RNA sequence: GCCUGGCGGCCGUAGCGCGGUGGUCCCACCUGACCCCAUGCCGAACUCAGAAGUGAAACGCCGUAGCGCCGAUGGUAGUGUGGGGUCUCCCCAUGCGAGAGUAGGGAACUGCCAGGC
RNA sequence: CCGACUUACCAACCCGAUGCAAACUGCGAAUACCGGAGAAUGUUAUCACGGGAGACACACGGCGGGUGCUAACGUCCGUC
RNA sequence: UCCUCCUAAAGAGUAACGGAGGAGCACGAAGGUUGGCUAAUCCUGGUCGGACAUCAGGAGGUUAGUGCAAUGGCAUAAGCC
């Protein structure tokens, strides 16, 4: 019948900036809806709840592809 | 003792004569025997558990394994699955003594070899036949169960050789004496 | 199969230990021999090893792969780590259940002074 | 014999390809898997006339480019969608 | 008639016609209707042109219909205002780019093929080309 | 130097399949188990003690490209910026340039430690 | 008929060729966008705080579209 | 009023009486940890288990599962015991 309904979503994409000033934790990839094809490997244990990838320590963000299934990996390493 | 005594006779003669085999255990060794009952949608009966105890624990005090319908696909009324499929696998040398009591009720008496029960011949590795009869009853009364007990028994070994098809049991199930 | 299932059971502890970046104490168990290895957190470079395939531990025990043989293996790897100067290694179960030979290996490493 | 005359291509690219087609030519390429690929330009209507004979794809033909002769086979023909003209052809050295 | 029996959604957006055609070569038969210029082929005109071709060839040879009308296009009816929902589907259409072979034939000679093709192009709103020789 | 075991790197040029090869060097089958633990029953699964036998399965290595996988130069589609013709589309200058296919590549390489020669 | 069945249709399925998708993706541009380093130019244009507003009824044209009939000096969006 | 996809132009955001669907809960386990396991489907032998009820092997990689819509994820399966 009447199909005029929609749900508001706010931001579902990365903002890894890698040089702007943010101490330790930043929502590197927030509301990404997934934990698997963007893991955390470098700066300890990300992907807490709602799969938001957040840093551990200060540094730049590294995007790499590794693993047997060629998934992506968000890593923070210090300067 | 039964496994080694069966290893003495009619096994190592199958290694060189008919089909030459490179190793000792290239011959299809008798792996685990299993039996499966066909109890239907009736859960209200209780005969299935002590029938499984009668067919499993005629010497020991073993217990069966029962589980629900976890694949859970049916055209019938039940979806999630009551316990329907009770799986029984023997322990240790009781598999061998079950085979030994089966063949000693099969060969000298023509009751267990009633007809042409072994007409199907398989070389895949699986051979099954519903016995629909007893082998050994633990009590004095040999027939107290009203059911004909159409359970399935599947010998799990590769029957490429015809020695198991002619020597131990035959297709026409006719015991022969000289 | 059995080895594939063992690796799949190990993967929790392996990527967890490689992801906290901790020195690990990895076991490999065969029915004929028992192995042990301590590995730096990068994973490509190992520090010391101890096994029953070497004669230095293998002459003492009449059978390689025993409870007290695994105890001797554990005291061997733990004294090698103590003379190398490393400490606070983490036990890496690596998919064998924590029972039997690896239990003897683990409390041998515990009573030989290698803290976890 | 079905000999063709070709010249080596002056410039590569989208605009060069469209300019050659506007000037009654079309690009093509010579490749063999053992020597470097060499890109040629040809008079469009002669290749039309010797393509209308269906023996182009059966026998090995010759290309007279720059004084040297290469014996090749027609690999595939890239044609215009709605025109009897074509845009590209490919050659395998044989 | 010449519509999909099931479709994932009952209406889809209008869109724009793309650049060029896709699948321009004769494949099944020996002769085909190579289209020129953009347009919209509906189900009734492709049925009419196929009926004209089959009538011209007198049940001889084989006719392949290459296109399929898989796009539902909606018409708002008469004396109804604008808005208040999309219209219901009236007819089924196949989007055509220049060069797409529409029809096919094999087993008839060149004369009867070109005759049936003349009648079909007379029924259709889209022009045709002329490459007619035998297939290898 | 050769052959194996463990942990890694890179993740199919690293995979599947065919034919061959190695046996207390090693690895894997194998005997027994109400000794410790275990089976929603089962010492197939998981453990313990081990001695016979085996390369059969499995593992590993080498030829096999039969398929998977990678895959250029060109051309094509598209497009950023200027300009032009217009039934909804396209052309020209310029920059960037696919995808699918084609020629082909391809049946791995390398690091630390331990064992037998 | 546990042999005359197994054809003049689906051989459920599967293989080869050809298409089609805003709610398909084993691929994938140009551009935009975010963040670094460098020169040159720009009345520091950028950011913060404080005083004072207006405005929240927009229109056409080009490009990307929804709707409409790829109708409208139609309507609703993105960008100039 | 709140979710999911598309329109939405490969950062977010982006309208319509535009195109399709869902929510106003549930669970003291369907939360935590430890330990374990891998699916949907095809086939041959087998009980009036006939195409599917329970078998036993190969193929077959998630083509099933997620308490409930859709999207994004899963083998560390977040699935199952």
Coordinates of C-alpha atoms (C1' of nucleotides) in Angstrom, one line a residue, chain H:
Chain H
rU1 C1' 7.5 7.9 15.7
rC2 C1' 11.7 4.2 14.9
rC3 C1' 14.5 0.4 11.8
rU4 C1' 16.5 -2.0 6.3
rC5 C1' 17.3 -1.5 0.9
rC6 C1' 16.8 1.8 -3.6
rU7 C1' 16.3 6.7 -5.8
rA8 C1' 21.5 8.9 -3.7
rA9 C1' 25.4 11.2 -8.4
rA10 C1' 32.0 5.1 -5.6
rG11 C1' 33.3 10.4 1.6
rA12 C1' 28.8 11.8 4.8
rG13 C1' 24.2 14.1 4.0
rU14 C1' 20.2 14.7 0.2
rA15 C1' 13.2 15.4 -1.4
rA16 C1' 8.5 13.7 -3.3
rC17 C1' 0.8 11.5 -1.8
rG18 C1' 8.5 7.9 -4.9
rG19 C1' 9.4 2.0 -5.2
rA20 C1' 9.5 -2.5 -1.6
rG21 C1' 9.3 -4.4 3.4
rG22 C1' 9.5 -4.4 9.3
rA23 C1' 9.0 -2.4 15.3
rG24 C1' 6.1 -0.7 19.7
rC25 C1' 8.9 -6.9 21.5
rA26 C1' 11.6 -11.5 23.3
rC27 C1' 15.4 -14.2 26.4
rG28 C1' 17.6 -15.5 33.6
rA29 C1' 19.2 -18.2 28.7
rA30 C1' 18.5 -17.1 23.4
rG31 C1' 23.9 -13.2 28.7
rG32 C1' 29.5 -14.6 30.3
rU33 C1' 33.6 -18.0 30.0
rU34 C1' 35.7 -22.7 29.1
rG35 C1' 35.8 -27.2 26.0
rG36 C1' 33.9 -29.3 21.4
rC37 C1' 31.5 -29.7 16.2
rU38 C1' 30.7 -27.9 10.9
rA39 C1' 26.4 -26.8 6.9
rA40 C1' 21.6 -26.7 2.1
rU41 C1' 21.4 -30.4 -1.7
rC42 C1' 22.4 -35.2 -5.2
rC43 C1' 23.2 -40.2 -5.5
rU44 C1' 23.8 -46.0 -4.9
rG45 C1' 22.4 -50.6 -0.2
rG46 C1' 18.5 -50.7 3.5
rU47 C1' 11.5 -51.6 7.5
rC48 C1' 4.1 -51.5 3.7
rG49 C1' 11.0 -44.6 5.5
rG50 C1' 6.9 -43.9 -0.4
rA51 C1' 10.5 -37.8 -3.3
rC52 C1' 11.9 -35.9 1.4
rA53 C1' 11.0 -39.2 8.7
rU54 C1' 16.4 -42.0 10.7
rC55 C1' 20.9 -44.3 8.3
rA56 C1' 26.4 -45.2 6.2
rG57 C1' 30.1 -43.1 2.4
rG58 C1' 31.6 -39.8 -1.3
rA59 C1' 30.7 -35.4 -4.0
rG60 C1' 29.1 -30.5 -2.7
rG61 C1' 32.2 -25.1 0.7
rU62 C1' 28.0 -22.0 3.6
rU63 C1' 24.3 -21.9 -2.1
rA64 C1' 21.7 -23.4 5.2
rG65 C1' 21.7 -20.7 10.4
rU66 C1' 21.3 -15.9 13.0
rG67 C1' 14.3 -15.3 18.0
rC68 C1' 11.8 -11.7 14.5
rA69 C1' 12.0 -7.3 8.2
rA70 C1' 16.2 -6.0 5.0
rU71 C1' 21.3 -4.6 4.6
rG72 C1' 26.3 -5.3 6.1
rG73 C1' 29.1 -9.2 8.4
rC74 C1' 30.7 -14.9 10.1
rA75 C1' 35.3 -20.4 9.8
rU76 C1' 37.8 -16.7 16.0
rA77 C1' 32.1 -19.4 12.2
rA78 C1' 28.8 -14.3 16.4
rG79 C1' 26.0 -21.0 13.7
rC80 C1' 25.3 -25.7 16.9
rC81 C1' 26.3 -28.8 21.7

